[PDB]
């Protein structure tokens, strides 16, 4: 039940996979921003 | 900078789906150039199948399903014994102006 | 019911000029924008120009500026005009809506046919 694409180099831009990171959202704070 | 083509070929026996694939001359295709899908009855009769690279238009049935499948245009439909014996034009919005593709003939069975 | 419909006489000889015009229904020219596509005998079918839903217009950059398209608010009527034909220049003419405010953004309705052939 398994099914493996082959990559390789010569695999074009669209059959060679593009590597996806998908972020999910108190800790993790944004930087605040400060003056003089 | 204006090539559009399809494969002008398809022939799906039922039950099995299949993609066409239209391709442009910028490579692969972003929605930010909007990919439009149409079929063509054998009387001049024309329908809207796909519409902004990922919708289905309003009114066609969800057996029609168009997305960016590979890195080009391209359109899935799910055999049909019947209904599906048309020709399919694939549209690319250009800065300026709209390009319509030069369809593609299905016969199924 | 939304429809389209697009009416004239469509037998032209060459050199003279002829115009089509296209009638609507269901929908207004506010909400929605009309596009032109035309059907040589045989071939593929080609973008003609395009109408603004609030005024401007835009033509095929090919095509020549010598031809206009002419549109109706109040009653609900476009015309579009050829002012000298060309014997390359038989085709099938078709109107078509477009609703770039919609979210089907892409042209939703097209026009029902006109023949148009030289001699």
């Known amino acids: 039940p398994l099914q493996s694409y082959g990559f390789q180099p010569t695999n074009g831009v669209g059959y060679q996979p593009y590597r996806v990171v998908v972020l999910s959202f108190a800790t993790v704070c944004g930087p605040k921003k400060s003056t003089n | 900078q204006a090539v559009v083509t399809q494969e002008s070929a398809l022939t799906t026996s039922p039950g099995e789906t299949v993609t066409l694939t239209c391709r442009s001359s910028?490579?692969?295709?972003?929605?930010?150039?909007?990919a439009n899908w149409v079929q063509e009855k054998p009387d001049h009769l024309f329908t809207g199948l796909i519409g902004?690279?990922?919708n289905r238009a309003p009114g066609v049935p969800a057996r029609f399903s168009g997305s960016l499948i590979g890195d080009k245009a391209a359109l899935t439909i799910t055999g049909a014994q019947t209904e599906d014996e048309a020709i399919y034009f694939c549209?690319?919005?250009?800065?300026?102006?709209?390009?319509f593709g030069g369809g593609t003939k299905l016969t199924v069975l | 019911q939304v429809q389209l419909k697009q009416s004239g006489p469509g037998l032209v000889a060459p050199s003279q000029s002829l115009s089509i015009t296209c009638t609507v229904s269901?929908?207004?020219?506010?909400?929605?924008?009309i596009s032109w596509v035309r059907q040589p005998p045989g071939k593929g079918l080609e973008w003609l120009g395009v109408?603004?839903?609030?005024?401007?217009?835009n033509y095929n950059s090919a095509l020549k500026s010598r031809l206009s398209i002419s549109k109706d608010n109040s009653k609900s009527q476009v015309f579009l005009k050829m002012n000298s034909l060309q014997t390359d220049d038989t085709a099938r003419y078709y109107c078509?809506?477009?609703?770039?405010?919609?979210?089907?953004?892409?042209?939703?309705?097209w026009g029902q046919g006109t023949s148009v052939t030289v001699s």
């Open positions: 109408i603004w839903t609030g005024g401007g217009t």
């Open positions: 910028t490579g692969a295709v972003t929605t930010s150039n909007y």
């Open positions: 078509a809506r477009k609703d770039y405010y919609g979210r089907y953004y892409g042209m939703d309705y």
């Open positions: 902004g690279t990922n």
């Open positions: 549209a690319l919005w250009y800065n300026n102006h709209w390009v």
């Open positions: 269901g929908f207004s020219l506010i909400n929605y924008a």
